[PDB]
Amino acid sequence: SRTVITEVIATADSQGRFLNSTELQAAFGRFERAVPAIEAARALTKNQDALVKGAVQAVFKKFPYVTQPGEKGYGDSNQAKCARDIGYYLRFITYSLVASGTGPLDDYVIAGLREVNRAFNLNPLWYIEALNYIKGETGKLLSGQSKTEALLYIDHAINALS
Amino acid sequence: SRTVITEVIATADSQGRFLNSTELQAAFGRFERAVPAIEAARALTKNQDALVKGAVQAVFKKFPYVTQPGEKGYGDSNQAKCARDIGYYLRFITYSLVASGTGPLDDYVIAGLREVNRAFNLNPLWYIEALNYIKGETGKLLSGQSKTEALLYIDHAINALS
Amino acid sequence: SRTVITEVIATADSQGRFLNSTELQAAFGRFERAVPAIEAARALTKNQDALVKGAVQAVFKKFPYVTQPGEKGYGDSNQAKCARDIGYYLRFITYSLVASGTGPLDDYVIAGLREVNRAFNLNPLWYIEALNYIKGETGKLLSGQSKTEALLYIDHAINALS
Amino acid sequence: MNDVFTRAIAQADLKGSFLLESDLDKLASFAKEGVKRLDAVAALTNNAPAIISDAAHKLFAEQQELIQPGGNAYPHRRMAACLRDMEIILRYVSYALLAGDASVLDDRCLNGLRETYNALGTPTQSVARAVQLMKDAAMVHLKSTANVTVGDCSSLYSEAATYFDKAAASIA
Amino acid sequence: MNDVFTRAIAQADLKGSFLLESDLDKLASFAKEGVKRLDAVAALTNNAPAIISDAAHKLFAEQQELIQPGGNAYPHRRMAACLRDMEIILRYVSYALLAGDASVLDDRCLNGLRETYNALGTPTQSVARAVQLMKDAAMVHLKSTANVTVGDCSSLYSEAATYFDKAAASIA
Amino acid sequence: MNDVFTRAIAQADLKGSFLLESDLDKLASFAKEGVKRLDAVAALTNNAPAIISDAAHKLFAEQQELIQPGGNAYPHRRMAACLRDMEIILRYVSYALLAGDASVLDDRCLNGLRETYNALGTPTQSVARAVQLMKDAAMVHLKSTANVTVGDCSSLYSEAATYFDKAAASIA
Amino acid sequence: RIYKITVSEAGAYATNKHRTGYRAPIRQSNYTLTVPYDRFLPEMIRLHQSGAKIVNVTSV
Amino acid sequence: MPAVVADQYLAMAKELAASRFGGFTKENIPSPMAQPESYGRDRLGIAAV
């Protein structure tokens, strides 16, 4: 997973030398901003259920037609799977926050995302709307640089979906 | 394009050899199947207006949530673009029939299909429904080998969408 | 071996795709051409012995010095080898006719042909003239499209030799 | 690769004598049902995504341990690999159907697929069940008489089921 | 590289139009005479060594300066390259006769050929002479009425002559 | 490829002198505004899909000849190439914005791109127009004061405009 | 001396192909590479950077 | 008021307008830059490679 410390090690290994000051600087930069990212992760992990349910309801509101008989929204198992999917996205957002890298998102969502969505006929716009709700909520659930961390990761996921 | 004659000649050239029996028999099969294919192209070209308007209407029936204001299908311009797109698909299907190879479909529709749809947020299921309607109507307009040819190319386009 | 169907399947697998219109049209051409080819194979299998005897004698008339003592064609063993070789060529021509592909001739005669004949000092013109005689009696023996199929396979062999 | 015509030619060459009248008659019959074979291959091709989706849905409903976290198909990448494997197996099966020989499927894929699945940690009975579900989904499309003239293709169904079950047993 | 069908398709696409009825009729005519086209391609392919041998003999009988020490085909290397060139031009003329469009020649056979010949110092006049000699030798085999049904194949003869001429004009 | 720091280092090195106190103060001020610089780079990176969708919509509404049959963006392939190019140029603009120097943009993106678009027969003026529209959309997105601590950032806006204009002037 | 390396492609490589993609055709995981001594260090470190796991290295 | 145009030209006009979806409108016009899908790779001579 492409954590910044991991990318440090990978680049130093690829160029076949020790850790010069250049990537020590980057590792330091991560180590300082770990605090806002970790507190954002904790805040997200606390409010997870409300965020998941609100994302589901925002999805159904923006796409009222989905819930109607005959397509993906209808069927209680389908709403259950919706809640589970926003739960997964939130979980990997927390992972990417605590790891200070898009690595968890990259290797747990984005990798293989389009083929999966295409094969199961799941609209990426559903998840874009859910993550938009999550972003709106975390805009007030967090303050300071932790908010910037959370918004960067949530929007990286959003751009991945689009 | 990747028509029978062109792929024959291209593979012959990439091996630095003349056209042998295999290639000539493939070309003979192409020249024989020309007759049903040109007949299908005639049938679809004569009936392009009814086919395309029916396809647009079928899309608007299977996707009622598109016509209302606030989304893609609302507005005369957007519906005109709908009809134009289905006319494109049908045009390239008739081109494939005339050329007896998916080359026109591939080059003009399939290459860049997913990226273009994602960029403009055009749901492939719309065009799948339109092409399914066109498949149904060609079941009635055509008979025998002409029907098989037309359906083969329509299904190629649909599989490319899904 | 190089058949029509194998070229189909290899071209489809090399591009990581399914069989489609162009490839099924090539296969259909193969299946249509099977009847003259199987007919020619049957007619050539009936008259293998007379064809081989005539081809050997044709070589001996065309290259009279070969039969001279101290040359290649002198001795019953060498003439038995000649008859065996002409039989080999005829058998692989029948195989190629059945397979609707030059794959049998290629794999079993043409690959390695020049080096082997160079090593054993076998003049290709001998086999070219023998195949010319076989081509001559294919006109008498076969008529229609089986005639053309047999002649084109024999011409493939002659082109490989020459 | 190898075809039924190629197989017969190989057997004739091993004994080094011309194809017999019985062999020619069988190959002529094969070329006679070649049109039906083309229809069967087109049926497999034109509904391949539907076959994959139906098999995947039935398999994952049957076995939820693959969906759940820690399963062998949990993240998006492992799901995509699952679908790609089903797709490639179907493609090879259709290749075997068109050729009439199982060589195109047996040669490159099934020999090393065993070691690959063992190394990656995939449950092999799960993949065999996936291929069997693919066969079950594909039979319906092979039967569908709409848009084709009514006829009998019991040999084609038997051979296609043979290829499907052979690949499933190989990976098993 | 286009054939006649793809050329018609490209024009129709530029107009944004379906193929007109008369266009489909000209295409059905082309495919209905496709059997004679296949026979002409077979005649070119099957006799290619003979065509190249005869053209080469006539060319070096006319132009002895090519095979004199200091000529452009003097050692074995240059003579072998010359014969390969004749082989290649005949190959591409057969490709164009099969497709019915001379796009294959200018796309592949004649793409940078003139520049090649200029940079190597090859006399382009002698190359065009060699192509004309091949054209003459090829016409003999194209009109050969043995083993084929008698018929009117003058369009094929003219088309092949124009392909040979397009080559010899692009080199020269 | 170098940033503002290495630019100063290169100018100092050609003279053969230490960096002057004024130069060091300039670089330190750059480092102190680097946080706002990161904000602007993140504004570009996050809203790239919206920027390019908007610029594409305006470009094809303004210049309809590109998207109609025969147009340079007409088939799906060429439309995808167009949108991909917009992606790429926006990417390199953001790179240059972070580095503080347009060297990465000019060296790795813009340099031979006019020649590419001439060879392919692409309208370089239309590409410049697309870069300009994408500039305007990007400027709308940078100036968004939401979720970011408020303060003066006019220098960054002007610098990003210079980068976009340099891209447009190089392509055209 | 020649060294034969039996490399098994594993999840570490599968993740890299899932991220970067397949610009080259997909292949079976287990294959053997033969190297000279001069090349053994670069090839083996390269196989490590690719995430491949070597199984056995035999000399010959 | 009789036919102002002979029937042959009406047929010719109808078939010209039929071969194009929607007939002749202001929005379905061909592009004045008449570039086929293969324009660049063909004019450059790099189609094969």
Ligand SMILES: CCC1=C(C)/C(=C/C2=NC(=C\c3[nH]c(/C=C4\NC(=O)[C@H](C)[C@H]4CC)c(C)c3CCC(=O)O)/C(CCC(=O)O)=C2C)NC1=O
């Ligand atoms: C850890 C990474 C991961 C993700 C993200 C994931 C999502 C996911 N959800 C699925 C099912 C589903 N997911 C939905 C989602 C819809 N439900 C509606 O209420 C909403 C409009 C919408 C959600 C916003 C639906 C309807 C299904 C059932 C249809 C199907 O895909 O088979 C499936 C198909 C197979 C399955 O059941 O698991 C996937 C792959 N799976 C994963 O392993």
Ligand SMILES: CCC1=C(C)/C(=C/C2=NC(=C\c3[nH]c(/C=C4\NC(=O)[C@H](C)[C@H]4CC)c(C)c3CCC(=O)O)/C(CCC(=O)O)=C2C)NC1=O
């Ligand atoms: C060569 C083949 C080819 C195809 C197929 C093609 C499709 C296509 N249709 C488009 C417009 C469009 N097409 C539609 C179609 C929708 N309208 C609704 O009534 C329907 C439900 C639905 C159709 C089934 C819409 C909504 C747009 C506008 C998208 C936008 O720019 O916002 C666009 C965007 C470019 C533009 O601004 O015109 C493309 C690329 N383009 C091509 O070059």
Ligand SMILES: CCC1=C(C)/C(=C/C2=NC(=C\c3[nH]c(/C=C4\NC(=O)[C@H](C)[C@H]4CC)c(C)c3CCC(=O)O)/C(CCC(=O)O)=C2C)NC1=O
């Ligand atoms: C010759 C043709 C060919 C085949 C057949 C083939 C199979 C193949 N499957 C693989 C992984 C995989 N294959 C599967 C599929 C199975 N696992 C279960 O979950 C499913 C029920 C089941 C699907 C029916 C999965 C999930 C992986 C991912 C394993 C991992 O990433 O650790 C890999 C490792 C490469 C990679 O993951 O990128 C190969 C090579 N490769 C080939 O070149």
Ligand SMILES: CCC1=C(C)/C(=C/C2=NC(=C\c3[nH]c(/C=C4\NC(=O)[C@H](C)[C@H]4CC)c(C)c3CCC(=O)O)/C(CCC(=O)O)=C2C)NC1=O
């Ligand atoms: C463009 C590619 C291509 C295709 C698709 C193709 C199919 C094809 N199907 C045919 C009829 C047929 N098709 C079938 C197969 C069907 N019968 C039953 O319904 C089965 C459910 C089903 C098999 C899955 C049969 C049995 C025939 C009639 C053959 C006969 O007994 O004479 C025919 C012969 C029609 C005639 O001359 O009367 C062709 C050429 N040929 C091609 O060149």
Ligand SMILES: CCC1=C(C)/C(=C/C2=NC(=C\c3[nH]c(/C=C4\NC(=O)[C@H](C)[C@H]4CC)c(C)c3CCC(=O)O)/C(CCC(=O)O)=C2C)NC1=O
């Ligand atoms: C510098 C290296 C080099 C060599 C070695 C060479 C040999 C050579 N000899 C040739 C003609 C020939 N060479 C011979 C030689 C035969 N005459 C018979 O009396 C003998 C049995 C036998 C010689 C022992 C013959 C018959 C021809 C005419 C072949 C023909 O016209 O097709 C040709 C064909 C073109 C020509 O010159 O007319 C070549 C290339 N050329 C070269 O540039």
Ligand SMILES: CCC1=C(C)/C(=C/C2=NC(=C\c3[nH]c(/C=C4\NC(=O)[C@H](C)[C@H]4CC)c(C)c3CCC(=O)O)/C(CCC(=O)O)=C2C)NC1=O
């Ligand atoms: C395996 C590859 C393959 C080949 C090569 C092939 C040739 C072929 N030649 C044919 C007859 C013919 N062939 C020719 C051409 C010849 N007429 C002569 O006068 C000219 C020297 C020459 C060229 C003008 C003509 C004119 C016909 C009869 C007319 C026609 O079939 O339309 C036919 C039609 C059969 C018939 O109706 O009798 C075929 C299919 N078929 C194949 O499947």
Ligand SMILES: CCC1=C(C)/C(=C/C2=NC(=C\c3[nH]c(/C=C4\NC(=O)[C@H](C)[C@H]4CC)c(C)c3CCC(=O)O)/C(CCC(=O)O)=C2C)NC1=O
């Ligand atoms: C993880 C990557 C990263 C981000 C996202 C980041 C943003 C960031 N912006 C900051 C302040 C700031 N950010 C801005 C920039 C804004 N001024 C206007 O509103 C513009 C719309 C906009 C930029 C064009 C300004 C003016 C300040 C306060 C002055 C300063 O501290 O430099 C701060 C310091 C604490 C704070 O006051 O919020 C951070 C951490 N820094 C980082 O290392």
